[PDB]
Design a protein around this ligand. Structure first.
Ligand SMILES: [Zn+2]
Ligand SMILES: [Zn+2]
Length: 49
């Protein structure tokens, strides 16, 4: 029962719904809100659920 949860690197809450993971940074993720706020805007991101 090893589980991987995804925490937003902005609000530090878990990412539920759309996940914006950085394509450059290893293991960097933002939630839909923090993405909307323009965080980490210098790196390309992958927007999957
Ligand atoms: Zn967030
Ligand atoms: Zn980045």
């Amino acid at each position: 029962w090893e589980e991987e949860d995804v925490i937003c690197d902005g609000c530090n809450g878990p990412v539920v719904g759309t996940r914006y993971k950085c394509s450059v940074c290893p293991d960097y993720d933002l939630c839909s809100v923090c993405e909307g706020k323009g965080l980490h805007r210098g790196h390309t991101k992958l927007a999957f659920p």
